[PDB]
Amino acid sequence: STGSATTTPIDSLDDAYITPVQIGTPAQTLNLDFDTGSSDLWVFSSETTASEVDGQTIYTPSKSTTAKLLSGATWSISYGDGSSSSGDVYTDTVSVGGLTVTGQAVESAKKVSSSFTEDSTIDGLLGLAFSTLNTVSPTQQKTFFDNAKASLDSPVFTADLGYHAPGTYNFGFIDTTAYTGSITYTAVSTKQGFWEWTSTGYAVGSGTFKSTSIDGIADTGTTLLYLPATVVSAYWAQVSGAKSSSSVGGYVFPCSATLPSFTFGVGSARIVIPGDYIDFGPISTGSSSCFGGIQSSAGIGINIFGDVALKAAFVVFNGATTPTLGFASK
Numbered sequence: 001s002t003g004s005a006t007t008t009p010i011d012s013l014d015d016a017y018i019t020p021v022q023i024g025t026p027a028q029t030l031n032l033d034f035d036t037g038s039s040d041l042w043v044f045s046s047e048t049t050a051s052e053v054d055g056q057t058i059y060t061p062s063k064s065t066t067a068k069l070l071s072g073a074t075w076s077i078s079y080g081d082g083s084s085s086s087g088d089v090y091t092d093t094v095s096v097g098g099l100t101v102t103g104q105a106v107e108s109a110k111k112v113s114s115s116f117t118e119d120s121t122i123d124g125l126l127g128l129a130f131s132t133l134n135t136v137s138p139t140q141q142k143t144f145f146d147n148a149k150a151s152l153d154s155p156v157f158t159a160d161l162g163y164h165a166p167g168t169y170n171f172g173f174i175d176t177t178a179y180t181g182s183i184t185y186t187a188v189s190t191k192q193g194f195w196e197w198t199s200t201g202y203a204v205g206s207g208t209f210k211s212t213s214i215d216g217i218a219d220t221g222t223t224l225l226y227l228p229a230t231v232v233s234a235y236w237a238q239v240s241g242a243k244s245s246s247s248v249g250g251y252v253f254p255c256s257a258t259l260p261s262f263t264f265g266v267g268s269a270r271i272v273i274p275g276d277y278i279d280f281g282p283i284s285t286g287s288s289s290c291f292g293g294i295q296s297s298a299g300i301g302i303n304i305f306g307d308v309a310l311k312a313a314f315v316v317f318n319g320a321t322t323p324t325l326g327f328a329s330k
Contacts, residue, residue, distance in 0.1 A: 003099025024064030035221030055120025200265030216303030
């Protein structure tokens with residue numbers, strides 16, 4: 001089997017991407033944030049505290065003939081941005097882009113933090129990191145990908161995120177029309193439960209490539225590119241008037257600037273992030289200070305190749321017995 005679904009930016013900045021997902025019988029379609037940095041499929045639901053719901057579409061298990069309470073199971077998750085959610089668990093039929101899993105754990109939110117409530121466009125998350133990170137207790141659950149894997153034509157999914165445009169998540173096949181040149185594959189460590197890999201270095205603009213190992217995660221659920229402070233300082237030094245602002249919480253730059261590109265290494269291959277991908281616009285409405293898309297990871301504890309980086313590439317998440325990542329230009 002295969003699946004193929006379009007993923008659509010939630011706003012004009014590509015802050016996140018939503019992908020329609022069918023849950024239950026008859027289908028209830030919710031728009032989920034596919035997140036390769038977490039392992040829970042959770043939804044706004046009929047159980048979510050009413051004051052914490054503001055515009056989201058909800059999953060109502062009582063209206064699904066295939067929903068079953070997963071008795072005694074609870075979940076609770078905290079993300080790197082300080083947001084959180086928790087609740088109880090149903091199993092139900094879940095389809096993405098024509099690919100169906102029966103018996104998927106659908107984590108129903110009883111509580112969500114303010115950042116979720118305030119984002120009316122995201123009806124929940126679909127985690128695509130390794131199932132070792134799934135938070136269901138006392139019986140850990142599998143991701144949608146792990147439950148689909150044995151049925152897929154190939155044990156892979158691909159992320160093809162757009163810049164200010166829709167893109168595609170595919171499951172079970174590699175669309176050879178969706179990228180240019182060849183795919184460079186690189187090793188993955190699953191020790192922390194992430195798609196963790198090691199970039200071979202970077203360049204700023206037309207500058208020379210610096211060969212240096214940068215361990216980080218491929219995380220579709222993170223907007224920006226978070227790299228070591230040395231790398232980030234070297235980037236922003238090429239932008240007149242850029243500075244790190246403790247009041248704003250990262251590097252800002254004059255909105256009048258033209259940003260340089262940023263290149264990262266994948267083995268001997270190179271992925272170029274155009275400068276315009278690194279512009280996240282005014283820090284507040286009407287400001288002439290703009291927020292940068294490359295930020296320091298120093299306060300996180302891991303480097304994160306978020307959407308800024310991934311949307312410059314066609315990315316293969318290879319879930320074979322020995323997982324690997326692949327990157328191609330596009």
